[PDB]
């Protein structure tokens, strides 16, 4: 059945379309550590023929202390994205945290992201909506998949129909997340079949890793419009998000598995196991 | 052991102090429906000798549609609070949703509230922190009680030590909340014994009521610094929050139970059941 | 509304009746350590005027290793109960794990208990049902309170209407339990108002204690037909159940709180907070 | 790393070995409806080259009423299995519910299954252990994967090292299950790498179906030793387990997907995403 299609330039992101990759790093540490990470992603996805979008946050708005590293900030962050654009010609996705950040950021990036914790705030959605940019909504850990149907409506109300839904796990007791593989279709269903992607790096959150490939495989096998991931040359030295970051050098072998599973799965004929 | 003390004028809010009431309505529908509700609360708490703070939100920032009733807005809302003040001489608590709302609102009310979903946003906390007002933090449904210790620190960093912690339930599967009666002490413990209150009306949330007295009794029996509640002359006609609102006429009999339980419990001698 | 009434000799156990105590120890370690524990319970409950039933298990059917201490066994266990009876004249409650144990045990004790994990096994219920003894059903950590309605029916089918329902917490993520204070009334409601008691010692289970009084207070404040508890002269030396055991010496001060809360709560007039 | 190997005749069931199928029906309704179902499974698995074991329960020990259909009973059930054996030459797996059923049943079947609710009962494990038969342990919905390590030990203690671990979901709030795709490896890890299979039909349990293929794909993509499933010519007419039963006619197309995913996944080179 007609899966909606959200296009990000030459890439068209859909559910029955081979998976698009929204990968990068957590925060824009240094213009140096970017170029590097971005460069590897481009090479690999280019070589494997995987649609690609580079992600990196420009401000950590919800850490633990008012003093913790938050990133280079909006202004400086835009500078880096611009170059990544000039230097590699990639599309970019980054999250915005306040209504007044939406356009300035849309002016620079291709996809603006609505953080999980602010997914229900009307003013941010609207500002984010009027921008006309492609939207990636992080599904709140505390909202059931059957409820994403409201958020997509909110955006349409604001004139934006380019919404992508991203699962990043659900609360499982205290300080724990579990990924409900059955949630993907529910989200699809209640959202007019909007594209559904899976953020494997945040779904692995405790309070990690040898399990990144396992969880990602599981999700991709369900049949998704895309995968969201973060990597790092050194996973336990980074400032912001800790483990759960995929080791940069492992990017290629990891993506071969994903593409392989996606191609196989997207290639299956329809199978109705209900009757 | 020394329970910290947060004072709101002539009321001093603490854990080993008879419970303070943060009660009112969900949203400032009409200056009319306020005066009324506020008037009943004052009369009853006055008569029963219950410390009291009137609560009402001035904007619904997280509803379901960009068009749903959100309240009278900041400006108009302040107008109503002012009168409630002039007409009854009460203290007021209301939630703020953006960093730029913190002072203007602190200028008018006695307690500013940090919504559950934005409890981890640094800029709001700081703005909210610099105001110097008394703070009521709604504990996120998705954060364990043992983590409230960070938020209190965030506020201190910003120069504010007048923080009250409020439990409003924890995610239990999808679209459901459960109240962990053991969380109250954990919150106490990790927060330098900050005052802990219980928002019984939001803890009853599905996707309600005959159970408001039951849940409230349970919480008060644990021994808390306060209770947070919302009422309405007509619980199923209100625009914003639905049921879970206590019927106004039932306020008095309800509070007699609470005070009775609180006085009895606060009156018990120390009981260490660990050794 | 008419709360059903289940009588255990001179004690009549009901929801609108002052709470009955089903307290004791986990396992029948030694005839020595029994007499002792049993003796203290009798003295205290006798002095406080609390209806009482002594509990102790005669076999640990679900430990971790085939070699772990399981208790004195059925035969030897009955011997000890008999004496406890002769020596103190108390009523007794113990759990049974197989259908062929039901009568032999009913012949000796006053209340037979259906373990949480076997609450849904038909043969055990029936054997347990035909015995005609008073039944205490431990609510499975994995079944919703709204489902206890089936189990009471199962017993009636087998000719037994003397069923008491006991809450012992619900699964909260992995290796954790949370007590839903709202479950008590649901259980009441779906079971023709059968008596509902709360097993505070098992509800405190991790993978404990300073919180026994807190949780117990919370539960008793809801208004229950009874409390289930285990104690020990030395809580961290016992073979079987670890902490969560109440220190024997603290029994009296603990029970004063419970009775006080129960008397106060059972004494309140009806309060309907739904309209 | 060496995955243990549990052999069931000419089939050797392991984690790095192509998946074995433990499929059939819920209960042995009629010798008629068996032959049929069994016949289709054999044909399909034979044609696809999928190792196969036929499953059917001979007694519903945990239904809702003492009168609900429970199956043909032990004796009569064995009769049917015998024929299924004579007529098709298949291996068989069935669950046992009491210690005295273990051998009589082992004498007839190839794999005996330990129900989820009785996974922690020592006497059943031992009886089940001494039998020397291959064991399939249903992981309790209420036990964390990290705990299966104890159960495998229990069996070894009883002299049985032919244990297969089967996931069938975990409690997610009330009346709901969620499948933690990360649990598979944890179970592997704490059990000396025992074979891990996934019971997709019971993992879909509410209080179902179009999602059977989706969930199964997800699990198989993680890389498992096997799949457990139940089917029926008519999924909503059956007496015992309702939906979640796969429509018999859909067996073949369903299994092609599974084999395809398994072969692809089992074929990948090692991928360590932790460093």
Coordinates of N, CA, C and O in Angstrom, one line a residue, chain C residues 148-225:
Chain C
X148 N -8.0 -11.0 38.7 CA -8.1 -11.9 39.8 C -9.5 -12.5 39.9 O -9.8 -13.5 40.6
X149 N -10.4 -11.8 39.1 CA -11.8 -12.2 39.0 C -11.9 -13.6 38.5 O -12.8 -14.3 38.9
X150 N -10.9 -14.1 37.7 CA -11.1 -15.4 37.2 C -10.8 -16.5 38.2 O -11.5 -17.4 38.4
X151 N -9.7 -16.3 38.9 CA -9.2 -17.2 40.0 C -10.2 -17.5 41.1 O -10.4 -18.6 41.5
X152 N -10.9 -16.4 41.5 CA -11.9 -16.6 42.6 C -13.0 -17.5 41.9 O -13.6 -18.3 42.6
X153 N -13.4 -17.2 40.7 CA -14.4 -18.1 40.1 C -13.8 -19.5 40.1 O -14.5 -20.4 40.6
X154 N -12.6 -19.8 39.6 CA -12.1 -21.1 39.6 C -12.4 -21.9 40.9 O -12.8 -23.1 40.9
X155 N -12.1 -21.2 42.0 CA -12.3 -21.8 43.3 C -13.7 -22.1 43.6 O -14.1 -23.1 44.2
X156 N -14.6 -21.2 43.3 CA -16.0 -21.3 43.5 C -16.5 -22.6 42.8 O -17.2 -23.4 43.3
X157 N -16.0 -22.7 41.5 CA -16.3 -23.9 40.7 C -16.0 -25.1 41.5 O -16.7 -26.1 41.4
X158 N -14.9 -25.1 42.2 CA -14.5 -26.3 43.0 C -15.1 -26.3 44.3 O -14.7 -27.1 45.2
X159 N -16.2 -25.5 44.6 CA -16.9 -25.5 45.8 C -16.3 -24.7 46.9 O -16.7 -24.9 48.1
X160 N -15.3 -23.8 46.7 CA -14.7 -23.1 47.7 C -14.9 -21.6 47.6 O -14.5 -21.0 46.6
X161 N -15.6 -21.0 48.5 CA -15.8 -19.5 48.5 C -15.1 -18.7 49.6 O -15.4 -17.6 49.8
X162 N -14.2 -19.4 50.2 CA -13.4 -18.7 51.3 C -12.1 -18.2 50.8 O -11.0 -18.5 51.4
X163 N -12.1 -17.4 49.7 CA -10.9 -16.9 49.1 C -10.4 -15.5 49.5 O -11.2 -14.5 49.4
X164 N -9.2 -15.4 49.9 CA -8.6 -14.1 50.2 C -7.6 -13.8 49.1 O -6.8 -14.6 48.7
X165 N -7.6 -12.5 48.6 CA -6.6 -12.1 47.6 C -5.5 -11.3 48.1 O -5.7 -10.4 48.9
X166 N -4.3 -11.7 47.8 CA -3.1 -11.0 48.4 C -2.2 -10.4 47.3 O -1.6 -11.2 46.5
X167 N -2.0 -9.1 47.3 CA -1.1 -8.4 46.4 C 0.3 -8.5 46.9 O 0.6 -8.3 48.0
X168 N 1.2 -8.8 45.9 CA 2.6 -8.9 46.3 C 3.5 -8.2 45.3 O 4.6 -8.6 45.0
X169 N 3.0 -7.2 44.6 CA 3.7 -6.4 43.6 C 3.5 -6.8 42.2 O 3.1 -7.9 41.9
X170 N 3.9 -5.9 41.3 CA 3.8 -6.2 39.9 C 5.2 -6.0 39.2 O 5.9 -5.1 39.5
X171 N 5.5 -6.8 38.2 CA 6.7 -6.6 37.4 C 6.9 -5.2 36.9 O 6.0 -4.7 36.2
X172 N 8.1 -4.6 37.2 CA 8.4 -3.3 36.7 C 9.7 -3.3 36.0 O 10.7 -3.1 36.6
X173 N 9.7 -3.7 34.7 CA 10.9 -3.8 33.9 C 11.5 -5.1 34.3 O 10.7 -6.1 34.7
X174 N 12.8 -5.3 34.3 CA 13.4 -6.5 34.7 C 13.9 -6.5 36.2 O 14.3 -5.5 36.7
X175 N 13.8 -7.7 36.8 CA 14.2 -7.8 38.2 C 13.7 -6.7 39.1 O 14.4 -6.2 40.0
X176 N 12.5 -6.2 38.9 CA 12.0 -5.2 39.8 C 10.5 -5.2 40.0 O 9.8 -5.7 39.0
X177 N 10.0 -4.8 41.1 CA 8.6 -4.8 41.4 C 8.2 -3.4 41.8 O 8.9 -2.7 42.4
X178 N 6.9 -3.1 41.5 CA 6.4 -1.9 42.0 C 5.0 -2.2 42.5 O 4.4 -3.2 42.0
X179 N 4.5 -1.5 43.5 CA 3.2 -1.8 44.0 C 2.2 -0.8 43.6 O 2.4 0.4 43.8
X180 N 1.2 -1.2 42.8 CA 0.2 -0.3 42.3 C -0.9 -0.1 43.3 O -1.8 -0.9 43.4
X181 N -0.9 0.9 44.1 CA -1.9 1.1 45.1 C -3.3 1.2 44.6 O -4.3 1.0 45.4
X182 N -3.5 1.3 43.3 CA -4.8 1.4 42.7 C -5.3 0.0 42.4 O -6.5 -0.2 42.1
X183 N -4.4 -1.0 42.5 CA -4.8 -2.3 42.2 C -5.7 -2.9 43.2 O -6.6 -3.8 42.9
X184 N -5.6 -2.5 44.5 CA -6.4 -3.1 45.5 C -7.9 -3.0 45.3 O -8.6 -4.0 45.4
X185 N -8.4 -1.8 44.9 CA -9.8 -1.7 44.6 C -10.3 -2.5 43.4 O -11.4 -3.0 43.3
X186 N -9.4 -2.6 42.3 CA -9.8 -3.3 41.1 C -10.0 -4.8 41.5 O -10.9 -5.4 41.0
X187 N -9.1 -5.3 42.3 CA -9.2 -6.7 42.7 C -10.5 -6.9 43.5 O -11.2 -7.9 43.3
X188 N -10.7 -6.0 44.4 CA -12.0 -6.0 45.2 C -13.1 -6.1 44.2 O -13.9 -7.1 44.3
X189 N -13.3 -5.1 43.3 CA -14.3 -5.0 42.3 C -14.6 -6.2 41.5 O -15.7 -6.6 41.3
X190 N -13.5 -6.8 40.9 CA -13.7 -7.9 40.0 C -13.9 -9.3 40.7 O -14.1 -10.3 40.1
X191 N -13.8 -9.2 42.0 CA -13.9 -10.5 42.8 C -15.1 -10.5 43.7 O -15.1 -11.3 44.7
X192 N -16.2 -9.8 43.5 CA -17.3 -9.8 44.4 C -16.9 -9.3 45.7 O -17.4 -9.7 46.8
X193 N -16.0 -8.3 45.7 CA -15.5 -7.7 47.0 C -14.7 -8.7 47.9 O -14.8 -8.5 49.1
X194 N -14.1 -9.7 47.4 CA -13.3 -10.6 48.3 C -12.4 -9.8 49.1 O -12.0 -8.7 48.7
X195 N -11.9 -10.4 50.2 CA -11.0 -9.6 51.1 C -9.6 -9.5 50.4 O -9.1 -10.4 49.8
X196 N -9.0 -8.3 50.5 CA -7.8 -8.0 49.9 C -6.7 -7.7 50.9 O -6.8 -6.8 51.7
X197 N -5.6 -8.5 50.9 CA -4.5 -8.2 51.8 C -3.2 -7.8 51.0 O -3.2 -8.1 49.8
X198 N -2.3 -7.3 51.7 CA -1.0 -6.8 51.0 C 0.2 -7.4 51.7 O 0.5 -7.3 52.9
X199 N 1.0 -8.2 50.9 CA 2.2 -8.8 51.3 C 3.3 -7.8 51.1 O 3.9 -7.8 50.0
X200 N 3.6 -7.0 52.1 CA 4.6 -6.0 52.0 C 6.1 -6.5 51.9 O 6.9 -5.9 51.3
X201 N 6.3 -7.7 52.5 CA 7.7 -8.2 52.5 C 8.2 -8.6 51.1 O 9.3 -8.5 50.7
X202 N 7.3 -9.2 50.3 CA 7.7 -9.7 49.0 C 7.5 -8.6 47.9 O 8.2 -8.6 46.9
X203 N 6.8 -7.5 48.2 CA 6.6 -6.4 47.3 C 7.9 -5.6 47.3 O 8.1 -4.9 46.3
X204 N 8.8 -5.9 48.3 CA 10.1 -5.2 48.4 C 11.1 -6.1 47.9 O 11.9 -6.7 48.6
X205 N 11.1 -6.3 46.6 CA 12.0 -7.2 46.1 C 12.7 -6.7 45.0 O 12.1 -6.3 44.0
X206 N 13.9 -6.8 45.1 CA 14.8 -6.4 44.1 C 15.4 -7.7 43.7 O 14.9 -8.9 43.9
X207 N 16.5 -7.4 43.3 CA 17.5 -8.2 42.7 C 17.8 -6.9 42.0 O 19.0 -6.6 41.6
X208 N 14.5 -4.4 49.3 CA 14.5 -4.1 50.7 C 14.3 -2.7 51.5 O 14.4 -1.6 51.0
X209 N 14.1 -3.2 52.7 CA 13.8 -2.8 54.1 C 13.6 -1.5 54.8 O 12.6 -1.4 55.5
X210 N 14.5 -0.5 54.7 CA 14.2 0.7 55.5 C 12.9 1.2 55.1 O 12.3 2.2 55.6
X211 N 12.3 0.5 54.1 CA 11.2 0.9 53.5 C 10.0 0.1 53.8 O 8.9 0.4 53.2
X212 N 10.1 -0.9 54.6 CA 9.0 -1.7 55.0 C 7.8 -1.0 55.6 O 6.7 -1.1 55.2
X213 N 8.2 -0.1 56.6 CA 7.1 0.7 57.3 C 6.4 1.7 56.3 O 5.2 1.9 56.4
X214 N 7.2 2.2 55.4 CA 6.7 3.2 54.4 C 5.7 2.6 53.5 O 4.6 3.1 53.2
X215 N 6.1 1.4 52.9 CA 5.2 0.7 51.9 C 4.0 0.2 52.7 O 2.9 0.3 52.2
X216 N 4.2 -0.4 53.8 CA 3.1 -0.9 54.6 C 2.1 0.2 55.0 O 0.9 0.0 54.8
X217 N 2.6 1.3 55.4 CA 1.7 2.4 55.7 C 0.9 2.8 54.5 O -0.3 3.0 54.6
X218 N 1.6 2.9 53.4 CA 0.9 3.3 52.1 C -0.3 2.4 51.8 O -1.4 2.8 51.6
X219 N 0.0 1.1 51.9 CA -1.0 0.1 51.6 C -2.1 0.1 52.6 O -3.3 0.2 52.2
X220 N -1.8 0.1 53.9 CA -2.8 0.2 54.9 C -3.7 1.4 54.8 O -4.9 1.4 55.1
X221 N -3.1 2.5 54.4 CA -3.9 3.8 54.2 C -4.9 3.7 53.1 O -5.9 4.4 53.1
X222 N -4.7 2.7 52.2 CA -5.7 2.6 51.1 C -7.0 2.0 51.7 O -8.1 2.3 51.3
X223 N -6.8 1.2 52.7 CA -7.9 0.5 53.4 C -7.9 -0.9 53.0 O -8.6 -1.2 52.0
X224 N -7.3 -1.8 53.7 CA -7.2 -3.2 53.3 C -7.8 -4.2 54.4 O -7.9 -3.9 55.6
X225 N -8.1 -5.4 53.9 CA -8.6 -6.4 54.8 C -7.5 -7.0 55.7 O -7.8 -7.6 56.7

